[PDB]
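Re: [help] complex structure
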Amino acid sequence: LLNPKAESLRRDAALKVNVTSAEGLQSVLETNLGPKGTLKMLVDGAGNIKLTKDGKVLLTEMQIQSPTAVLIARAAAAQDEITGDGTTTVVCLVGELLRQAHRFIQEGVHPRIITDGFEIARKESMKFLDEFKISKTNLSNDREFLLQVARSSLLTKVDADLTEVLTPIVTDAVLSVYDAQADNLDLHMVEIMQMQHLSPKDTTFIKGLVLDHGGRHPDMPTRVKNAYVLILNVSLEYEKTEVNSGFFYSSADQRDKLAASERKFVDAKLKKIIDLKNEVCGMDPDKGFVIINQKGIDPMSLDVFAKHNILALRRAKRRNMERLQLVTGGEAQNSVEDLSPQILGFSGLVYQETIGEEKFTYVTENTDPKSCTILIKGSTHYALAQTKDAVRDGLRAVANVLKDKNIIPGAGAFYIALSRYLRSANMNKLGAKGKTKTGIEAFAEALLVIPKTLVKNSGFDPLDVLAMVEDELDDAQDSDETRYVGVDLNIGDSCDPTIEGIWDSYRVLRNAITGATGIASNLLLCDELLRAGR
Amino acid sequence: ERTTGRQAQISNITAAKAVADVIRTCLGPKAMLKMLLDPMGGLVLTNDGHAILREIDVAHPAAKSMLELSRTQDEEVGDGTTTVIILAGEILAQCAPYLIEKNIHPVIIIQALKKALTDALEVIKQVSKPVDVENDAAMKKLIQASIGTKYVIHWSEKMCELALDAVKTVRKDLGQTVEGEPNFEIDIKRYVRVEKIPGGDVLDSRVLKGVLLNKDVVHPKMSRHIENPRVVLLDCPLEYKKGESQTNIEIEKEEDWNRILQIEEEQVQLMCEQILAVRPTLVITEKGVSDLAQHYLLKGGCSVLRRVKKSDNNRIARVTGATIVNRVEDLKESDVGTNCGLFKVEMIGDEYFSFLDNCKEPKACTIMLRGGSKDILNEIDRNLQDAMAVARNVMLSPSLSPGGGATEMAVSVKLAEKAKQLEGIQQWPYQAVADAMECIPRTLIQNAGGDPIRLLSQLRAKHAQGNFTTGIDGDKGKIVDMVSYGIWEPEVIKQQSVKTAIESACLLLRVDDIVSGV
Amino acid sequence: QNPNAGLFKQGYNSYSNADGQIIKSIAAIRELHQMCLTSMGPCGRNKIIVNHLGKIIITNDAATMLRELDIVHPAVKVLVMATEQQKIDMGDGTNLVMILAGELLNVSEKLISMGLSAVEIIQGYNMARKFTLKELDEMVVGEITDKNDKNELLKMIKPVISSKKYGSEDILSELVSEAVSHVLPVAQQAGEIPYFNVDSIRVVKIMGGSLSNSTVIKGMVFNREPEGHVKSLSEDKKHKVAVFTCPLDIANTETKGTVLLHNAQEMLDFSKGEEKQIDAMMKEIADMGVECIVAGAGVGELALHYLNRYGILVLKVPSKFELRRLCRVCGATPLPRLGAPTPEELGLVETVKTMEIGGDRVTVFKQEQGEISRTSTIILRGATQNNLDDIERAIDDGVAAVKGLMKPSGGKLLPGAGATEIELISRITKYGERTPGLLQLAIKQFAVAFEVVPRTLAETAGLDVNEVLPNLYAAHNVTEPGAVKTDHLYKGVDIDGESDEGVKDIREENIYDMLATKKFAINVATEAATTVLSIDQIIMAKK
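Output below.
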């Protein structure tokens, strides 16, 4: 009962293959869970090596041969487009759920019963999530909570040393773009830049924008205080006769004379620019003048600008000009003849940074730039990639926390509490039937994988840590008090996540649980494997 | 190359069984999922029976024939895509030992299968229960089963009404001894296509008792509302005409180029007068229409539509009765499409309309669907197609049969009881068919996670000693009364599934060898 | 390279149900089930089996084939033991038991394929067995009244011979009836006191002629040359017969006593002693009236001369069984010593003569008026050894069956040729339909298992089963204008072979089967089937 050029799995072979693939994927992503996890090394074969820990990036870049593993990875990748985190959690939950389901199936439990039990446990876990969350306040002085959230997000991705650098940077960058008002949050207001030949710890935060192109004249001021930003779209390069002409001569002296005569066109515009500079705070103290000049500038015009204590850039990207239109408030002048003071903007200190391979300009310290820039600094490609990924993850986590005020303490407290709540309530109710108890117990046990994996990664024995956490929870319940009990990966004993400062996003946990349950149900319902199209 | 003896029959039966076993688990709400693995790295976990039977490649010709049968039934009938294959495969498997072990000739098996088909149809008719096809409440309740628990669950309330209204508009309930029973001549594919109108809500959707045309007036100075419309259809364009053979235009003076325009005016005027001779109110031409022709037709007091596709005219001739004449000079007074309702062009949702409805029964209509987005419109269109197919199945025979395998179990029991009294060699295939009918309840029990043996035995005992309305519960998995739980399926689907499965089994049994040939 | 997991007992042969051994055992049994299916029925056929001595064995008995065939699989051994039990206890129906067990296992295979647990199958088989055994009591049509007459005996003898030697049942039944009538006592209507024994009739064959030349002897027959000058005795009644075990020679002591003639003195002394002792012993035996002397050992030259002198019949019987038969016939007691004609130990034979049958002369010891013998001998004639062997087997089967006519359902008669099987099929099907639960499938399969007998009869006769089987079903399942079935309800399975339509009624040929035989065969077959099905794993240790 088969056809050529095809292969199929019969009886329970499909279930065994799917379970094995899920276990393999879990073991692949088991070691990188939590701040105590490890990093994976990826080689593309072209000489580029990536050292990454984020589950989404690892799944996207890594090639997967097992079709079931491919399906699991693709399903878990949805977390990135919804919550931005929890892919590893989804994979671990799917793996443990499939392990338990296979164990029960070996005892004769039909897959549909397990699926129904998983659905019931999912509903109960959603109820527990609703009852267990903590409402965050809307106070504008919540900077401490944002710092705690950023630290929690970063510790999972960094070596615990760059955390002190990235936490304040991420917190400030996210807070500046989203003021203490309803409005809205858009992470596109935060620019991400990378620089080479610098120490990893050099990463800093810039209030405003940073321009790639720098000055090209030694006499330009290094720093300009309270500068007026001028954006000019008219090219200041050498101009020729407006009508048909040429350079026909017997000696280069005639060509030089013709060039000097033709330079008057640029000279006239330079005169207007200098007049504007002089009129607007020409000699006022603590004032400056900076010109962007999107288009190119002739060296003679650069020297003319420098001799007037004017810092002029050239050959800037249109995107940079559009960003400056808001960062500095200045407008782009299409024609010098219509140039007027109203075009000029205003900005704080303007500093030029010289690098061996390039030169940057800073246009930060703006009254209301409605944007900010984060400068990732590193000496190696992998370090820069890791820093960028950590910064983006922290930005997304803080944005999710700000937009969604529902906050749930982490440190493994949520998973253990949910497992206990399920084991109690589902067994006390038995709302569907006894036969669903197998699936209920499987789901409850699988939900405990995350704390066990975290403890295993931290090097401590999961049994003792789980026993201590359960004992503390039992004591709290006997005391008739509300208490959150988590896992301290540094000491090994139990700890209160609300005091240490470990928190998890409501959306992340909700989506991870839903996705894991859905993937487990879909895989457990696979009766056979079919091959076609060959 | 060549296969002789029982080997060819064994090969065909094995191919049929292999095809059936794949989808054996595609029945019931508890249907299991399947993995489709392409030669590349992509795969899906779709559980749709049609998708499984479509994406599965089979080398054996019998499997290809079975897949083609299922694909054809997927459009001929609204349901039973997987039931037909499962039933045919089970029947073939049951008949296999008789052909192989009992040395029974295929002709006897085929005849017995046909007789069992007749008996099964009789039993299905006996066990079916009537429904009220005239009361809208009963039809809405029945059709809600195929509309709820879907993307259109939100608008189900109005979706049921829209589908029922469309089906009734295309449904012709007639009974007499002169022309016979038309069988309602329901055609959804051709004359029920849904028109997607952006904007509005589902509750705003209406059923047009005719054809809706999206062609606006070809000239602003044209009537937009006729209370006594009459449609005339033509193909030949109204413009300058050249000779059948090569035609050359030779002009000496520049001003003489107006001769072509004068000839065009003369010909167009003659054609327009010929068209107007039949007292028309709207002129539809498949080919292009010149501005002069539009002016001449307007002078006669009628509207003009040009470059209209044949698809519109095919339905216009059905809802208006207008006869299309290729040549204008051959137009006849009797070709005018009288008995037309209106030419109203009221715009809905910033879209152009042209209603050609009436209070007649042309067995054609148009569904004016409204929605808040294109995705909603497409999903509602698909759900309305499914609901109208279900309603057509229900209304083609005012009765329904119990679901959950009760009908199959009752058919098996009655077939066994009748076969016990036949007293002939054919008794064996009748028992094989009766046993194969048990496939559906076995699949339901297996998908529900119950006992495949004890539950089936209890159901069979209940049918033998109790009523035939007992079946397998989709959720509980126990033996319960289908009527109490509201589990039902249309009788038409069951009859068609049984007939097609038995006919396919007979056809496959007829083939006793596969030989190379071109 | 392939790892081996789950095996811990031994590398020796071992089977478990995890790999479907429950069906593999049935498949293995099918190898001999097919062999035995060709033996049952009047149109059965023999098979050629080569013995370990290089001889050719041809027989229609399935039990003989099983004995001459090598049995390896324990599942086959179970059926072999069941067949042996059937033969020992009943003496007939080995084919019935074997075929019924095979069909029960075959249907059990289908039940297992359907997914029914073996426990339910066994329970249903037990229930169906009990139902069938109870029903067989009501299926009796006729009954043997135990008149001991040849006409009544033939009714049971004829069907027994059939299916063992086809085409000669008419003559073999007459021969068996004649032989039985010579040994049956004067009694009627008495089934509690045994009268007939299986060993009461001896079967012998003589080459030459045909079966039509066979006859029956009213006494013991010896097929060995007398080795003497006296060939037969006169017709005088009550001839005294002396039976000896020591060779007829000079009497000596128990220890040693060897006589060796080395020289003239020893020669003369031993010659005189032997002559005097032999002469005295023979004279003393003759004076008592002994006309015949039978010795289990040889006879000396002087012994032969003196036996001729007194006209004493000379006969040697090296077979102790023949000596026991002679002693039973005449009542004589074996004499371990010579010259001891004790009247209390001498027997009496009314007539002793040498008769020529087909050119071969044999000695017959028969009784006419006094000391009537309770044993008889059947002499078979034929030019073919295979036919003679088949006839001997048929005669033995008939003799064994005759002993079964006692009270315990011996006289009860059932309609043969599958009619009883069809009636049981219908009754068991009805019972299974009435029986609730999963046992109905097992009851229906048990009923179906009985369809083999009509199928085997149709196939062995060359008839088309596709037409015979529905005809049989219609004949046994009829609708009559009344609440009670009537007309010909005893239609069986006919063999025809020349021209016929449908089947013939049993009463036309009086083909009946013993109730006890069928009942015991069904019981044994069901027990064997249950035993085989109850084994889901076989574990053995290497020798």
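Residues 264-287 of chain C form the longest helix (24 residues).
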